[PDB]
C-alpha cells in the first residue's frame, strides 16, 4: 500500500526523530510536550521544510491513538470563513475532551489563505478556550496574517534544509530503495534542491526510473541532469567564457550549440550565469547594477513568453555591455 505511493508521501516523517534540519524547533517542542504545557504555535518557513510533518508527528506524540477525536485539522481545501470559525472551531474548543489527553489541538494549515474577518474572529477563540485547546498556525507568507493573530502565537521559523539534513535523508532513501548515488550526483541534487526535501525525493524517483537497471547501477550527475533537464556546471562556464571573451558571432554559435545539445532552456542558463557571476569580484559597482537589472527584465520577459533567440541575444548583449564598464 505504501509502496505504491510517491516518494514525497511515502517518506513522510511519522515521529519527531525523523524530522531533520530543524533542530532548535524540535528540541523546543519536545520539551514543551515533556512539560505538558504546549503554547499556541506558529510555524513559518519555505515550502517543503517540514512544518506539517512536524505538527502531525507532534500531535501523534501528544495524543497517541486519540489523534482522531482530539485534533481538528482545517486547511485551504476546506472552507474557513467567518461562519466556519464561529461554529465549527468554537464548538470544538468549547466542548470537553472526554478527559482523554487534557487539552485539544486545532491545526490551521495554510492559514495565509484565510480571510481577515476569520483571523480576527479567531483571536477571542484562541485566548478564551486556551485552557482546553491550543492552536497551531502553519503559514508560508506572514504578510497575509493579521498582526494580532501573530501576537497571540509563538513563532517558530523553519529554516531551509541544510546540506547535512539532505544528505542524512538521502542516505535513508537510498538504503530503503537499494539505490547507489555518486558523490557528485549528491552534490548536484543538493545544489538543485534549494532547501526542499520534496524536490529531492521527486528528482530521486525520476533518477531511479531513468536507470535501465535500478540495482547494480549508480546514479551519476549525468543521469540527474538528464532527468531534471538542467545545464551541466561546464556548459554554463563555457557559455559565460564565450560571452565574456569571444566575439558576437562565436558566442552566439556557442550558446545555440550548448542549448541544442541537450534541449536546454534559457531560464536555467540565466539562473546559472547569475549564480556564477554573483561570486565575481566586480570593481565598478555599475557592472552589477546593469547586470542584475537587465537580467531581471529578461527573466521577467521569458516568464511571459516571446521569441527565444531574441532573448538569448539580449542576454549576451546585456552581459557584454555590462562588462564594458568594468574595463
Ligand X SMILES: Nc1ncnc2c1ncn2[C@@H]1O[C@H](COP(=O)(O)OP(=O)(O)OP(O)(O)=S)[C@@H](O)[C@H]1O
Residue positions in the annotated binding site for ATP? 8-12, 20, 45-53, 140, 198
Q: Verify binding: residue 247, other proteins, rule CB under 8 A.
A: yes
Judging by beta carbons within 10 Å of its beta carbon (0-12, 13-18, 19+), is residue 35 exposed, middle or buried?
A: exposed
Q: Verify binding: residue 75, Mg ion, rule CB under 5 A.
A: no
Q: What's the N-to-C CA distance of the chain in angstroms? A: 63
Residue nearest to Mg ion (CB): 52
Q: Which stretch binds Mg ion (CB under 5 A): 2-10, 46-54, 261-269, 273-281?
A: 46-54
Rule CB under 6 A: which of 27-56 touch ligand X? Answer: 47-53
Q: Verify binding: residue 314, other proteins, rule CB under 8 A.
A: yes
Q: Verify binding: residue 88, other proteins, rule CB under 8 A.
A: no
Region at 251 (left for phi over 0; alpha for psi -120 to 50; beta for the rest):
alpha
Give the single-character DSSP code of 83. H
Rule CB under 8 A: which of 5-34 touch other proteins? Answer: 5-10
Applying CB under 5 A, among 12, 32, 33, 52 the residue interacting with Mg ion is 52
What is the Cα–Cα distance from 168 to 149, expressed in whole angstroms?
Answer: 36
169 binds, among other proteins, Mg ion, ligand X, none (CB under 5 to 8 A by kind): ligand X
Closest approach, Cβ 301 to ligand X, in A, equals: 19
186 binds, among Mg ion, ligand X, other proteins, none (CB under 5 to 8 A by kind): none
What is the Cα–Cα distance from 16 to 31, expressed in whole angstroms?
Answer: 12
Q: Verify binding: residue 198, ligand X, rule CB under 6 A.
A: yes
CB of 213 or CB of 234, closer to other proteins:
213
Helices 183-193 and 163-177: angle between axes, nearest 10 degrees: 120
Q: Verify binding: residue 123, other proteins, rule CB under 8 A.
A: no
Rule CB under 8 A: which of 211-230 touch other proteins? Answer: 226-229
88 binds, among other proteins, Mg ion, ligand X, none (CB under 5 to 8 A by kind): none
Q: Are the beta carbons of 291 and 277 closer than 8 angstroms? A: yes
Q: Verify binding: residue 252, other proteins, rule CB under 8 A.
A: yes
Q: Verify binding: residue 12, ligand X, rule CB under 6 A.
A: yes
- 3-state SS, 169-235, equals HHHHHHHHHCCEECHHHHHHHHHHHCCCHHHHHHHHHHHHHHCCCCCCCEECHHHHHHHHCCCCHHH
What is the Cα–Cα distance from 306 to 136, expressed in whole angstroms?
Answer: 44
Amino acid at each position: 500500500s505504501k509502496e505504491n505511493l510517491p516518494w514525497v508521501e511515502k517518506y513522510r516523517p511519522e515521529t519527531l526523530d525523523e524530522v531533520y534540519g530543524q533542530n532548535e524547533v524540535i528540541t523546543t517542542v519536545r520539551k514543551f510536550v515533556d512539560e505538558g504545557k504546549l503554547p499556541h504555535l506558529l510555524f513559518y518557513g519555505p515550502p517543503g521544510t517540514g512544518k506539517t510533518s512536524t505538527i502531525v508527528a507532534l500531535a501523534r506524540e501528544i495524543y497517541g491513538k486519540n489523534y482522531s477525536n482530539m485534533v481538528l485539522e482545517l486547511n485551504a481545501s476546506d472552507d474557513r470563513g467567518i461562519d466556519v470559525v464561529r461554529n465549527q472551531i468554537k464548538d470544538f474548543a468549547s466542548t470537553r475532551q472526554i478527559f482523554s489527553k487534557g487539552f485539544k489541538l486545532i491545526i490551521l494549515d495554510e492559514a495565509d489563505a484565510m480571510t481577515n474577518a476569520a483571523q480576527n474572529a479567531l483571536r477571542r477563540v484562541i485566548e478564551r478556550y486556551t485552557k482546553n485547546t491550543r492552536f497551531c498556525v502553519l503559514a508560508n507568507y506572514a504578510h497575509k496574517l493579521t498582526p494580532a493573530l501573530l501576537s497571540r502565537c509563538t513563532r517558530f521559523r523553519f529554516q531551509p534544509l541544510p546540506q547535512e539534513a539532505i544528505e542524512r535523508r538521502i542516505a535513508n532513501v537510498l538504503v530503503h530503495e537499494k539505490l547507489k548515488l555518486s558523490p557528485n550526483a549528491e552534490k548536484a541534487l543538493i545544489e538543485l534542491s534549494n532547501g526542499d526535501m520534496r524536490r529531492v525525493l521527486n528528482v530521486l524517483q525520476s533518477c531511479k526510473a531513468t536507470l535501465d537497471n535500478p540495482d547494480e547501477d549508480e546514479i551519476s550527475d549525468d543521469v540527474i541532469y538528464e532527468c531534471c533537464g538542467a545545464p551541466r556546471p561546464s556548459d554554463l562556464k563555457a557559455v559565460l567564457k564565450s560571452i565574456l571573451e569571444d566575439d558576437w558571432g562565436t558566442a552566439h554559435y556557442t550558446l545555440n550549440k550548448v542549448r541544442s545539445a541537450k534541449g536546454l532552456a534559457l531560464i536555467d542558463l540565466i539562473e546559472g550565469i547569475v549564480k556564477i557571476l554573483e561570486d565575481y569580484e566586480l570593481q565598478n559597482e555599475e557592472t552589477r547594477v546593469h547586470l542584475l537589472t537587465k537580467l531581471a527584465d529578461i527573466e521577467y520577459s521569458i516568464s511571459k513568453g516571446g521569441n527565444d533567440q531574441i532573448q538569448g541575444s539580449a542576454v549576451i548583449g546585456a552581459i557584454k555591455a555590462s562588462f564594458e564598464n568594468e574595463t
